[PDB]
Design a protein around this ligand. Structure first.
Ligand SMILES: [Co+2]
Ligand SMILES: [Co+2]
Ligand SMILES: [Co+2]
Ligand SMILES: [Co+2]
Ligand SMILES: [Co+2]
Ligand SMILES: [Co+2]
Lengths: 220, 230
């Protein structure tokens, strides 16, 4: 089958993901993250633009229309409710719920979502600390790249957005290092964009710049 | 998206469904149930035959190869574990779980299935009474006792006076007709329910339940119900 399960929904969530990372939603990012050629993402975006889902600007940045935004929120809502179910009730390992939820978000109905809100006891966040959007319509902080250079700082981990969950090796390293929602950790800025989690007496864990954008923390 | 989610997997499970119903698996039945044109299924069948998933027999019937049957079993196992999860844990109405699970069966990993057998307390049957197949591939060892009894499809009961039976299984085909599966739910025609059944002129069967309107099953749906005479 189609590896993306629902191509149009993944284009929408990817753009939403990029907005959550504070980076500019571009066709080049969609191609890299969804493993699709330049031509292919251009054709698909034009089709989505035709269908009133996206707006392409002269400078190349992609925006979601009001119509496309509501659909993006609905997919992300199913994604984060599925991750809570997978972690809290099913017991699938933390670092594995993202790939599973990335498939389930395309087939879950809103009736299951509403049942999950009650079964999971009104969850407001995913297992990675991200807010669950669209609960209203269902019917029911600093980023790691904004830190002074060359100096350590004590922070409280709040969110790990969807981009960083896509790198299993890295997400496993972060989990093992205690980089999980609501945990306290001290980080240090690496000269070339990346950030570093300080681990006393052990090799530190380096977050490349694109992954540092995907981690939201609170200054202690 | 593709409304079937995974077309090859629906092809595989439709042939398995037809075998559970005791009817000949045919391209025409796939076309009708999956809503595809004759050519489209003719072209998918050939491709799946060349991919070693099935074969077209001399008399036209469709047969799963060994390779295809293991794949069909994995889809059905996922389907029926998804149904158990939807009813026991999520609480989605019994009559709505089949359509949901028909989508979930194509995206559930074996890792999740392995967790579900533990979380659901070692299930062996779906909420429609059908045995969950291929549990040995998930690491479940068989339990003492064998699966069966004295099960007769409703289409095997003889024409005559009303017969008292206990419903044991409702296969995927009757679940796929939302109006009928909802009527069976509302009349209490569920696994282990006691009803009386009478054969109808054209191969159909009428189910009589005290306090509810009769539920008449066309012959194709009667094939999907397995009972035991009281
Ligand atoms: Co995720
Ligand atoms: Co996805
Ligand atoms: Co940046
Ligand atoms: Co017949
Ligand atoms: Co079913
Ligand atoms: Co299906």
């Amino acid at each position: 089958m189609n590896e993306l399960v629902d191509t149009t929904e993944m284009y929408l969530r990817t753009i939403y993901d990029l907005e959550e990372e504070g980076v500019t939603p571009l066709r080049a990012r969609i191609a890299e993250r969804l493993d699709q050629s330049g031509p292919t993402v251009s054709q698909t975006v034009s089709r989505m633009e035709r269908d009133g889902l996206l707006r392409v600007a002269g400078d190349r940045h992609l925006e979601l229309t009001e119509k496309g935004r509501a659909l993006a929120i609905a997919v992300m809502r199913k994604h984060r409710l599925a991750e809570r179910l997978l972690v809290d009730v099913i017991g699938l390992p933390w670092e594995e719920v993202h790939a599973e939820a990335c498939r389930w978000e395309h087939v879950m109905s809103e009736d299951v979502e509403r049942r999950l809100v009650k079964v999971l006891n009104n969850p407001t966040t995913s297992p990675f600390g991200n807010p669950i959007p669209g609960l209203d319509e269902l019917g029911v902080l600093v980023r790691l790249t904004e830190l002074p250079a060359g100096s350590p700082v004590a922070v409280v981990v709040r969110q790990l957005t969807e981009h960083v969950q896509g790198d299993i090796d890295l997400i496993t390293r972060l989990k093992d290092a205690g980089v999980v929602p609501n945990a306290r950790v001290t980080v240090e800025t690496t000269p070339g964009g990346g950030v570093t989690i300080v681990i006393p007496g052990h090799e530190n864990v380096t977050l490349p710049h694109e992954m540092a954008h995907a981690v939201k923390v609170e200054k202690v």
